[PDB]
């Protein structure tokens, strides 16, 4: 009268999961596969970070008085804020998004002089909208202007040749006056025309005076143009008036990554996935926080939770 039996274990309360042919099956254990938590800071240890403040990314090429300490920077991570501006005199760039995308991964810039010299005309044109200790202008460009009121501007030509083994970046500007009298007061009567030439580039520009709404107390405008130079070529400028001449050329170095954020910076932390609210640190394959994260991040799904079974089916007593 002897007996032996076989059986398995069970637990008081289990977890509900989904299978191929039912929803809500109870098991002993389960785990989670979707991430929902973050850190409200920028984790950066082991990399060089540059935190631009009031300076815009595109200002570092021209140098308004608010970008005086970022003229030649080196970094592995670049952070841009919402209050950054890149102009001291009213105006805007042309094809700005491509330039921003180029600069976000440059890893820094290096400046080299050009060597242009001028005779006869003036050079020290200044305005009251860009003040350092008085009236000043951009730190890397020159406002040519004329010898005196209502004078003649000789037609001139200038040239520059690249020498190093990497492409260079060239930037210049055109000035649109606020009326038809200021143009004749600053560059004399007649017609004005500029032309830019290179091996794979040829363009012409002509000003257009007129009255506009007042921004920063001014009515004129400035337009900025840029080009990229192969490392054996030559660039030629031919001009007669309304020219903002460059003074230095920029070269890239290395590579990096850039983000836009609005939180502070922590130097005792580690991460590789960033978004506009902090850092995501996890090993799970899916996330449900943001769809525009950058770096090495898990994929984005629209579900809130997905449980994975880790035990047998639960059959409690009684």
């Amino acid at each position: 009268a002897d007996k032996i039996c076989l059986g398995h274990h069970a637990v008081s309360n289990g977890t509900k999961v989904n299978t191929l042919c039912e929803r809500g099956v109870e098991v002993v254990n389960a785990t989670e596969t979707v991430e929902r938590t973050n850190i409200p800071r920028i984790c950066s240890k082991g990399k060089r970070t540059v935190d631009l403040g009031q300076c815009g990314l595109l200002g570092t090429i021209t140098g308004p008085p608010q970008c005086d300490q970022f003229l030649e920077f080196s970094a592995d991570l670049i952070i841009e804020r919402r209050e950054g501006s890149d102009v001291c005199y009213p105006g805007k760039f042309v094809n700005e998004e491509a330039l921003r995308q180029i600069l976000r991964e440059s890893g820094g810039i290096d400046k080299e002089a050009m060597g242009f010299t001028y005779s006869g005309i003036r050079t020290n044109g200044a305005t009251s909208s860009c003040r350092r200790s008085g009236s000043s202008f951009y730190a890397e460009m020159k406002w040519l202007l004329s010898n005196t009121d209502n004078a003649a501007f000789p037609q001139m030509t200038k040239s520059y040749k690249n020498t190093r083994k990497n492409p260079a970046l060239i930037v210049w500007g055109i000035h649109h006056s606020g009326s038809t009298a200021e143009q004749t007061k600053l560059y004399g009567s007649g017609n004005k025309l500029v032309t830019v030439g290179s091996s794979n580039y040829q363009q012409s520009f002509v000003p257009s005076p007129g009255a506009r709404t007042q921004v920063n107390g001014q009515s004129g405008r400035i337009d900025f143009h840029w080009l990229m130079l192969n490392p054996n070529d030559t660039v030629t400028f031919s001009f007669n008036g309304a020219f903002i001449a460059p003074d230095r050329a920029s070269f890239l170095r290395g590579k990096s990554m850039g983000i836009q954020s609005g939180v502070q910076v922590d130097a005792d932390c580690e991460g590789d996935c960033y978004y506009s609210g902090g850092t995501i640190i996890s090993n799970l394959p899916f996330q449900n926080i943001d769809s525009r994260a950058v770096g090495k991040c898990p994929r984005y799904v629209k579900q809130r939770s997905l449980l994975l079974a880790t035990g047998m089916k639960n059959v409690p007593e009684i």
């Binding site: 009268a1 002897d2 007996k3 032996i4 039996c5 076989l6 059986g7 398995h8 274990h9 069970a10 637990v11 008081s12 999961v17 989904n18 299978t19 191929l20 042919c21 099956v25 596969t33 841009e80 919402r82 998004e97 921003r100 995308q101 976000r104 991964e105 990554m257 850039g258 983000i259 836009q260 996890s282 090993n283 799970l284 394959p285 899916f286 769809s291 525009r292 950058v294 770096g295 090495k296 991040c297 898990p298 994929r299 984005y300 799904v301 629209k302 579900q303 997905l306 449980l307 994975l308 079974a309 880790t310 035990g311 047998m312 089916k313 639960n314 059959v315 409690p316 007593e317 009684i318």
Partner: protein
Amino acid sequence: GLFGAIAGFIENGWEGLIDGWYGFRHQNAQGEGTAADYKSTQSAIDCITGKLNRLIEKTNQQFELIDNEFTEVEKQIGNVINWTRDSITEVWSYNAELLVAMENQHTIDLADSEMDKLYERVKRQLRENAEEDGTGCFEIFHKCDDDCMASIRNNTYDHSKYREEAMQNRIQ
């Protein structure tokens, strides 16, 4: 499961088993006793850890920005970007929902098969000396003490010793 052992002819589990997933329970003239098994638990745990190692890991590919959230971009290209991102999100949402259900379905069947194999091995070990009863236990037809149960639990049971007495008890 589709093997019909867990939640099948075994009515319920035991909440007193705390050192394994499967085990024995014996009752003889002296008293009751309980123990646990090692091989099946190891197999199930190994399968679970293999699945966990296979699943938990993230990618190695790096992505960057293509639009701006401070100043907007031209409409005709932003529309295309938004359309593409929304198209990708659906595929990535569908894949996970399929995969999780797949694995959840597989695990329970694995556990059921392990329990059935453990039952069948013990049934084969005791030949023409014990009788089934239908609820997961066997009834022995001879006198078996603690040492005999211990020998049964670790594959050292010789059926030739008790054959004649068990046969005589069963036939009459």
